[PDB]
Amino acid sequence: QQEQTIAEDLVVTKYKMGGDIANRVLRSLVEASSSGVSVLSLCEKGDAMIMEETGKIFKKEKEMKKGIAFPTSISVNNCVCHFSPLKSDQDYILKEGDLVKIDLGVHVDGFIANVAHTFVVDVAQGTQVTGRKADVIKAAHLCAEAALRLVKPGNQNTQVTEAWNKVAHSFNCTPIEGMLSHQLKQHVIDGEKTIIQNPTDQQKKDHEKAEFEVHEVYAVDVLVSSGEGKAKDAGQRTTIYKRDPSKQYGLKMKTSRAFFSEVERRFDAMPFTLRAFEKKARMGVVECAKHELLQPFNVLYEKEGEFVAQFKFTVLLMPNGPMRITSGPFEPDLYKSEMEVQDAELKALLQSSA
Template sequence: MSNMDKVMQSEAAKDGVMIPNNMADKDTDEQEETIAEDLVAIQKYKMAGEISNFVIQGVISQCVAGALVRDLCSLGDRLVLEETAKVFKKEKDVKKGIAFPTCVSVNNCVCHFSPLASDTDVELNDGDVVKIDLGAHVDGFIASVAHTVVVGSSPSTQITGRKADILLAAHYASEAAFGLMKSGTENQAVTNVVQTVAEGFQCKPIIGMLSHQLKQFEINGEKSIIQNPNEKQRKEHEKSTFELYEVYAIDVLISSGEGMAKEMDTHTTLFKKNKETYALNKKASRALLKEVNLKCGTMPFCLRNLEDEQKACVGVPECVSHKLLEPFPVLYEEPNEIVAQFKFTVLLMPNGPQKITGLSFDPTAFQSENSITDEEVKKLITSSTRSKPNKKNPETTEVAKKPDWLMILDTKIEELRAMKGVDDSPNLPLDFQLQSLHETRSAPVQGVDYAAIHGNILALMRGEEPKKLDPGTMAKFSQLWQLHKQRILALPEVPFPEFQPKAGSALESKMESTEQNSENWSAD
């Protein structure tokens, strides 16, 4: 996590009866950013992914016999806030923090268990199957993760029986799903492969559970993947196709029972603000909504993390009844069943899917009498495992060697080369067309290497290998690229042809002066 220290509140909500606007509620048409449009967005996703992975490992380390679930949930949330506070310290307008509150769901509890101080707590025992689910975000770019552990287990003792079945089924279903996360794949393919894997271990996916596309400040994006749908859900669920640069949180939940999750007497503590508006009557409801808007925006939150959870509980019913808040109910399987969960966040990149969250899992620690029989699924899982980076294998392809940010730059370069420039001198060397990068602001942003930005664009346009930029410079480059690409003429020839200005012209004088001052400004 030390690298994050090197990387790079909001306007107050209006006091009233209507839902106020907040920076977290960005207009999707004008302000939403994607990894294709913002070069630093991928860095923010990965920063959030590193934080989520780090935090969940910290929570897992405390999942021992005698531990209390409330303490574990509080630990996870506290760690997320501490770690996200370490990044983008100087950027006051960058929101960051909890994208999904820490939930610790034990045995037959399926999901969303994150108790308040006033709730009955749960103590962990040896042999319990514990699911930890959480998420972090940096500037609204979300990374979610979930993992399942068996309390008291050790590498020296193999887990058998139904516990082994559900853990192996959930793990392999997750791996198979990852293998399908490519541009052009239909969401139903993931639904089907999860079902196939679960059936191989005599298990059932939890009916109707959704995996969502992620967007900036939006945890439940437009596209989704459903697992084990009933007939009505299968007919109503919208079909979709994965596209390049999309981001998904793939959530796999497998049950030893029938996969029927239902609410019981545990009251809901997790909510998410919707975009509905309504004139609330109760003071407690208005105060709750104001605090949520200020602290959480559109991200899910736990009542435990608000200033006064008791007062918040008073305001919840009115907000929920008028659909201002969306609840995440605590769900359960039958008491004698157990459920396992694995969740990872994946970026669909030009050089293949990039998994930014998810912990390692050792299937050899589990012994099951069941197995996957479908040969195509076996091949898919094998290819998914082999596609993971192997630092010891030097025989990687040229595409695999390219970092994600360079793949995005390559795409933008192609766009630029296809553009028609607005400069009147079609043969003007690129060096001088990019001079404005140095002169964009009267007061340049501190810490941004403008010369490196200029040099990298030159290198890329000439087909040369660019240098990797630090995150702050990368962020500024992303902005400058959008501002200046209409002013940059890109000719198809690489390198650019020699250009001789008219004798005695101002351009000739400027070129001569610049060449004398720096070799970097020489016209190739």
């Protein structure tokens, strides 16, 4: 009963302002991406820009929390998600032709605006991206377009799941199995109401069918692969975590207890990167993650040589229709695929207005 929702104009404003910041920071990072650029540097730049820009709004409200909802993550080629290296980790240096996914989130007073975008590094003027890179990027963006049209009051999450499989297969691509798009609420990045990608038979049973409703907010997250779509851990150090306020445990080590306290104060229940702490965080993390006080956002990979594309946007289900508050700077004429959507209903859906 105490929820602040988009029925309130002020709440819509807070979402829109966080969305404007997310959009601006994303575009800055895309422009800063060129051959030879350090992924660590881009992650640090993104996060700092989020803090600086949120610092400049609602200045008179000195107690209002605002800042990072999802730390800047830059996941290249077959890397799926959540790459945000520690200073001590192996960095990654961008190469011409790399496929890059930038994923980040901003919050204003707990209202979250998440965005992610895919592009290719240093595409030359007057050329197009072709091949499997083009296939997977076009597939992922058409999945995003389909979701923009289908995530509306009265529709079912299952409709989205089905459309995504049809679109992706049109390009001989596969949405990554089991990945979720969450409803957002104030202070809640991971609402239990979700859209699931390409669920296994077991995932279909464990996942709840649901109907979208007016005043709900979603961070729609499309991740599509040129390969089988069964993402796996590959020994990469997890750096992104979130506190889970539903779980409690009295920690045995003073370092763990103090780390717990610092996490709660600084981040509440927003995902954060360990780079925000490096040694003393590493030990505190161990006990907290072990007893489920922190949830990891692991770095997952598709098969070597394959490509994973992503588009994520946040949408407000307003009485007058869906209102998207974030998006990436997608240029369709850049991508040429041998394939196209052939399905009549799907083609109709994609040509219709959003």
